[PDB]
Amino acid sequence: DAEFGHDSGFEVRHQK
Amino acid sequence: DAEFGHDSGFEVRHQK
Ligand SMILES: [Zn+2]
């Protein structure tokens, strides 16, 4: 699991 | 899941 904080994060950092 | 590539991403971007 991770999506409770993970949207994406690859160059753009986490947006939520 | 996203943990297979998620280590973080909040300030540093994704490292895994
Ligand atoms: Zn992430």
- The residue among A1, A3, A4, A6 with the most chain B CBs within 10 A of its CB, best to mutate, is A6
Positive/negative CA dihedral, A4, A8, A13, A16: negative
d(CA A6, CA A13): 10
Comparing CA positions, the residue from A15, A14, A16 lying closest to residue B6 is A14
Binding-site residues on chain A for chain B (CB distance < 8 A): 1-3, 6, 8-14
Closest CA to A12 of B14, B5, B16: B14
CA A16 – ligand 1 centroid, Å: 10
Burial of residue A6 (CB within 10 Å: 0-12, 13-18, 19+) is buried
